[PDB]
Amino acid sequence: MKTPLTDAVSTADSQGRFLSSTEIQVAFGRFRQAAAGLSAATALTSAADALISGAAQAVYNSFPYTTCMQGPNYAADQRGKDKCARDIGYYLRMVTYCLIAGGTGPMDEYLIAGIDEVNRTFELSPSWYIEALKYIKANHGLAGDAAAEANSYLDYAINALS
Amino acid sequence: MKTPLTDAVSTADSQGRFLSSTEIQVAFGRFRQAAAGLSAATALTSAADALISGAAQAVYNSFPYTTCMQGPNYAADQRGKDKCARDIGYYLRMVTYCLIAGGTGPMDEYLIAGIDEVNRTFELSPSWYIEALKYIKANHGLAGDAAAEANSYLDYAINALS
Amino acid sequence: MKTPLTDAVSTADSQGRFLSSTEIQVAFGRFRQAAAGLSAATALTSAADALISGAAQAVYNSFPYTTCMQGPNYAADQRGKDKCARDIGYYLRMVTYCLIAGGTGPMDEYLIAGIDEVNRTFELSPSWYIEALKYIKANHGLAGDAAAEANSYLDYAINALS
Amino acid sequence: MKTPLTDAVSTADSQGRFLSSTEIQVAFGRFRQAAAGLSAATALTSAADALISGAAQAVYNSFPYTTCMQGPNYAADQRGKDKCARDIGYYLRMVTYCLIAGGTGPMDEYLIAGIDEVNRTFELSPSWYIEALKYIKANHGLAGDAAAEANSYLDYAINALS
Amino acid sequence: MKTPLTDAVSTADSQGRFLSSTEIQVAFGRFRQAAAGLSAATALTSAADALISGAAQAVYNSFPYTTCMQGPNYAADQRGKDKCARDIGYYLRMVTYCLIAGGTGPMDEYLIAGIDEVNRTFELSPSWYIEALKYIKANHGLAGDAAAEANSYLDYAINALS
Amino acid sequence: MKTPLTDAVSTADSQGRFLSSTEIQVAFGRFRQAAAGLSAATALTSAADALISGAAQAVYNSFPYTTCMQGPNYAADQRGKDKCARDIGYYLRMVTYCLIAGGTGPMDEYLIAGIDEVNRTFELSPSWYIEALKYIKANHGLAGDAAAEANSYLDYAINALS
Amino acid sequence: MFDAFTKVAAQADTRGEMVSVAQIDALSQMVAEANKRLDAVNRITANASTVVSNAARALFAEQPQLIAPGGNAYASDRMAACLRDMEIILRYVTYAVFAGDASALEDRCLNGLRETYSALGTPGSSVAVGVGKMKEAALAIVNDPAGITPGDCSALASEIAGYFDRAAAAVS
Amino acid sequence: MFDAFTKVAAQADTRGEMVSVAQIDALSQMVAEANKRLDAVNRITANASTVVSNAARALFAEQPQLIAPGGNAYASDRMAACLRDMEIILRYVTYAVFAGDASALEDRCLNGLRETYSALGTPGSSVAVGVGKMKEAALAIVNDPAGITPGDCSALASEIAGYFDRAAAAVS
Amino acid sequence: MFDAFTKVAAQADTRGEMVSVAQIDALSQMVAEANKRLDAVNRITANASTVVSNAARALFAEQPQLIAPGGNAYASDRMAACLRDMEIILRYVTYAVFAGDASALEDRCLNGLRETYSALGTPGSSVAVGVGKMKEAALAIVNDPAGITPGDCSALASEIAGYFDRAAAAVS
Amino acid sequence: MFDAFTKVAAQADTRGEMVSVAQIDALSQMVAEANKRLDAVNRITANASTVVSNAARALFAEQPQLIAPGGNAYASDRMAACLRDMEIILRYVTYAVFAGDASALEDRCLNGLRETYSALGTPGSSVAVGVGKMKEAALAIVNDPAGITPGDCSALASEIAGYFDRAAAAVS
Amino acid sequence: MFDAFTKVAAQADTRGEMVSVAQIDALSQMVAEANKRLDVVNRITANASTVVSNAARALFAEQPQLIAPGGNAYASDRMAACLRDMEIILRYVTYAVFAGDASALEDRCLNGLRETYSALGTPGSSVAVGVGKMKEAALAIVNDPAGITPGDCSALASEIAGYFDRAAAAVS
Amino acid sequence: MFDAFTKVAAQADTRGEMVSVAQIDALSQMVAEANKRLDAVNRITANASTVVSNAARALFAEQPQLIAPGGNAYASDRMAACLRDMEIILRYVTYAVFAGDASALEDRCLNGLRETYSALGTPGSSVAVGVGKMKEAALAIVNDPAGITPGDCSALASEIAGYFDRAAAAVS
Ligand SMILES: *[C@H](C)[C@H]1/C(=C/c2[nH]c(/C=C3N=C(/C=C4\NC(=O)C(CC)=C4C)C(C)=C\3CCC(=O)O)c(CCC(=O)O)c2C)NC(=O)[C@@H]1C
Incomplete structure (x- = not known):
């Protein structure tokens, strides 16, 4: 579950050794970044709804066919319009989890592992989700380390979906 | 070679993945600690001779028999007296290496792996070296992070020879 | 390379045994089918251009956005329009090879292994190719066993892609 | 258990894949051969007693010592005369089983695996059984595919016993 | 190559240890037995031709068919009569080797491994060789330990064929 | 548990074979040695207390610091003076055991495996125990094979500890 | 088998x-009747991912607790695992039809599956519902008179139903 | 974890x-409170072999039946194994502290340990006493005011005790 | 061991x-009395395939249902497995005699064997009769006065019977 | 392949x-011409151990130095290995015929074989003679007019000879 | 490393x-200068799949023979393997930058790569062109003034170019 | 062997x-002469760690460059490895004596050892000197008249020298 702390414990454990100053240094890094990370999460949480509609609408703009094609993979009805916001919601929620944990762990485990099968099975296009994430980058409005960090996760999702 | 940097790379490489924000955090921790560490190394290096003779002398006091017993494992002659300082030198030198690298790596690889066989084969007592290390602790005269870090490696050597 | 003949030899070889009546029965099956198979291949080959344009045009109909979106994964220019035909070409050609070989082998090896990665990387939608294949089914105009067999490979590609 | 059908399913299962046209062609082969096979089985079953005594008697001719040496591996008493026929019966029965299953399976599993240890332990000569099988070939009186296929199993036994 | 000496070394080496009093005791065992062993070898070697003809002839008596049946597995010609003596020769020679090495090693390696395939392939009956070996037992004329030991190898061959 | 008998059985069982004259020869060597060995054990047992104090005392002479240094690993108090004799007692008892078994087995299993970690952990010097065993050699007063064999175990302890 | x-x-x-x-x-x-059996297997297989995906969709619409956060099919890991099972059960049903004997299915798939689900907390009864939906779609696909020689497949259809039914019975 | x-x-x-x-x-x-947690890990670690060896010695002095011939820590093989366990439990305790969550310790160390000991005939209760002795020595080492910035570490010390306490509970 | x-x-x-x-x-x-022990082992060993094959034959003659089609020794696979078991039990009996202790036999052969047979449907009681017949043939071979220095082997005989007896007790 | x-x-x-x-x-x-090809495979297979054994016999008669003590086929181990090779070569020839392409034989059998024999000291030229004898017996078997529908098998016979010939060429 | x-x-x-x-x-x-080094790592990483995919596309455009049937990147198997290599080289280039030392790259990636390609008939020179394209896109991405504290990254950029360049030299 | x-x-x-x-x-x-051979094996073995450690010490004192930082026996890892090699060579020499044949030593130890040292950069000639010192000490220990039945061991001593010599020759 890739986070600085669990990752450090994990190597030590797998080499049968007590934590050394290396792992303490890992912790230092984590705890120093956490300041920015926790901020950015509170920030994203509070802009949650604006970000989700925003993104959803962005995707419908880049890909207008998704709001007119019939059939369950698209958002021409309200059912689908809802599934879509739900999923973008999921992406953003994971990003906040990443920010809190200080690593991709939570997104790795709750969203990315198996995404390829879901999208292939249900005929969803990764291109759509990439657009949603792109929007969240342009519009989250965080500054400094909170920004560079949140962006790292948003870009990571993009890389997974490319 | 256990250091924050090579450790971070190592896990990423073994999971076949690009470095994420976790490993960047590792590097932050490392680079922040480096300031204190590199200082402490400079300090120790300059006090090199006082520390080594001081230590050797400490050991000969705790264990006077080592300066009178005949035979090659002991320091009753100048030959032994010199091997002994050489060894303590090696310990200290590794401690500086650890400070610089930010982890036990260099001591693990140059000194620790194999020590148990050397001491058994040549009949050297771990208790003598523990005493030398204890003296370096009491007398390096470092303050703050430099001190907490150097002591971590001095104690680690002590834990390895116990 | 999954074909009745090579599959039969393969098991026998993995069990370290000479070919028995089982594998002769496999070859019987294969040689019987081949009459229909080689015909169907000759037929599809001669309808090659009508099928490919027809197919490409079907896709452009189901998904008109693919002929106006800018950028390389789409066919709004002639470069793309060509890539697309080329790819449909490839699918049909593999189907003839499967018909000849009496199994999916050639498509498994030249087209199916790795497809997922190509489509993800270059942002090509499996839904597009699914429509090309559906068209080839509806319009190859084969009868009897040639048809049942050709369709089995066209449906397989669709299952791999869905 | 080597038969066209189970062999087909087996490979598919071990490759984790649904059955393709290749495995349908295996079945075609099997079902086509079944007609001859099931006939041959009916025929051999009805000539069971003539074939068994005949064979037993052939063996006793080729190897007359077997009907006079004392001791349990031979047929100088009724006990042994009976064992012998029982075994010849087993061989024939297995041949019918193969004819029905469309492969060596049943004979591999009920008779062939372990035969070498039984014959060594009980001092039975493979040469005796070989002569029995040779007789069954000469005398079953089958035509066409029924013959070619029965003979394949009779010869397989001979090969196993060589 | 199963002999007290090489077995001893073999275990020691596989456990990565120097030879202890155990393996010295193995060698005591071996060297003590050697006196009898080497004598027995000398004795068997000098009665070699009487033993071989004797045995061959015994075999031809127990199994008269072997001197009348046509075909290459039997001794109805000189060619086969010669193969037979050759083989009995081989058995006896291996027994001497086993007496000299102080274990079954030489027989295991030169004769026993592969015997079952040779006798199946060339249609030679183990019963025949068993009879030769029985004859060598009854007629070697050795006394005491030389007898108990030589007999042990003769019986071993008999157990292997069987 | 390294002894001629269990070693012999062990190889045979790992090669899935009945015992042959090789292993009988192993038992011969053991049973032959056993006369000297069981006598040696009776002798050492009855000089048990002289040998233990003797040895303990010898150690205290070679290493007088052990009787003065404060702290638990040493014998400055009666507590430690008792631990020490206990331990030497253990070494001697194991040596009797090895004489009885005819191998290092019992000492390997009760004493040797793990000794390195005990001595490192509790800070006990192998040198001390080497001096005890050296005294036991010089003073057991055994003659002939008893002596050669008993010394073999004493020396093996010394090798393990060196 | x-x-x-x-x-x-x-x-x-x-x-x-x-x-x-x-x-x-x-x-x-x-x-x-070999040929009809084979058609049965070709048709079900040639439509497997439609058979699966539709049944999974129907199931989730019918049972939203499955995919609500907290539900056994929530999380991509789990959803993917669930689709995977549908597909496997289908694969093993087709193997049974092809061979004309339930063993491939009983031995390598159904046996112990009930206990697997129980330990994980997967609601077997739900899986059965999934299996049931596949059975109907499968059957409809074998029975469809388009593009085949007309004839009676009813006995075969009864056999195919059988295999689905025991898959459903075995989890649950 | x-x-x-x-x-x-x-x-x-x-x-x-x-x-x-x-x-x-x-x-x-x-x-x-990051910095105090890391001090807490460094200090227990930087003293691990003393913490182990002293606790082991106290335990054996207290319970001679353990090292009397016949007892579960008699024989080099077994003494070494026993020391090794004390050390392992301490190592996982420190992981838990560092991570600020018991799971590493529960999952990779304590879980099933009670059954292991019972099968072997290792007196878990005795392990617990050992674990207990290490708990005291550990805590006294984290609480020592020499050479550190003064402050309150009481909540942390409570957390550390907890981890030890569950280790003692788990074997036993 | x-x-x-x-x-x-x-x-x-x-x-x-x-x-x-x-x-x-x-x-x-x-x-x-080492020498008699070793004869004991050499003699049983040197006649092992007779001891086995004769016991197996008498058994089947005595118990036809074992080799009648349907029975646990019918089919070459199973017959071979059955002789193999006879042979194994004898092999472990001779180990025990050689070492002069039942453990090799107890630990590596008898222990769990009863349960193996039960699971498979092998009639253990039948195995025991097999074991018993081997015991008699073995004992007669060790006791034969021909070609050996005359002496008392009765104690040793009693030991050897012991080992066989527990082998029969243990499956059954 | x-x-x-x-x-x-x-x-x-x-x-x-x-x-x-x-x-x-x-x-x-x-x-x-499928049917002839398959007879070609059935007939060679159905006579495989006669093909092998007779060829090996002719070869050793012809070349006694092979089985004289010291020679490469002396010792049971070696004789068995040698029969084994003859058989393998023949098994891969029949695969070639069955598939109608030399690759199974080239890739999995012949390739590197010359170097294998060289390292061991096996006289490849001898192996070739063995192969050659097998080739004749095989061909004679496929060509026999008894018990088959009369027809021309000459192209197929030429193919089969081909596969033998390259085996012979490959070791040597 | x-x-x-x-x-x-x-x-x-x-x-x-x-x-x-x-x-x-x-x-x-x-x-x-730690911070700058880490930005570069984050920047190349956070753009990895655009860096790869664009380079791959440029390469094939420039070199059609690679994706013409018969060329080393024709067949999905091969195309995927090829993109996979691009992505690997890049992954090891970023490791080298993060560590500030070429070894991760030399030892675990480049070493023996030239020989692997030669054996397979991958045109190394082509790979080098692919590596080259990635180098440019990478560098432009690290040098982009947008959304970063302005400062001199020239020396670092020269370091990064170096790693790419030896990747190129090593294949070829 | x-x-x-x-x-x-x-x-x-x-x-x-x-x-x-x-x-x-x-x-x-x-x-x-068995008995003398076995005394040879027991005496060399019973003194192995003296033989090794003393020779290792004389060698380093003779060849300081070996243990100077930078030298092949510098670093604990390397020193330990070097001692380990001395001890291995001695172990295999004693095997050779006990078996009365050089093969154990030739096959399992010396063969390819020269090429291993060359690749690592261990100075073989130095190893030879080590081996040579061990030879002298060993020989002196087998020849010592104390505590053994007086006799001529000269031929044996020559054999033992032999084995050490080829070890020295094999590596240098
Ligand atoms: C040459 C190396 C030196 C030498 C040897 C020597 N030894 C013996 C006699 C015996 N040696 C043994 C050896 C062992 N006995 C044991 O119990 C063990 C371990 C269990 C060993 C290795 C034995 C049993 C004997 C028999 C009688 C005895 O104790 O002396 C001799 C006599 C010749 C013989 O071959 O038996 C000789 C010459 N003697 C020297 O002068 C060299 C220094």
């Missing part, structure tokens, strides 16, 4: 008998 | 919720 | 004691 | 082409 | 020396 | 002959 032939040979052997003329005819007849 | 952050992220996910303003503050606060 | 010596060393060690003058004498006497 | 079909599909693919009306015809033709 | 620090400790150790005040300063300075 | 006996049996078999009265006598004589 047994196929239809091999299942019969097995029982004959424990009795030490040669297959009776009646039994040989029974198999003979199963031979004569 | 979970660490303090990750344990919260897990629980929020099963609810499909973002971590609440309260829970982010709770974590924030645990971040601000 | 233990041999005669090693069995006694094991018990002495759990007491922390050196073997007593009595116990050394008991061993010493076992040494003095 | 390739079979006749697949070897042609491989070549067309590196050209990016559909097989030509000519090359489909060539394959169509090879289909029409 | 070495990182910047570790590489200097290695060299000092083979000389039995403590790192000189000059060499400590050199590292100290490398510490002072 | 061969032992004295087995080496002769091997040679007699490639000739198809029974060992000659002469060669039996030769072995018989080697049997008669």
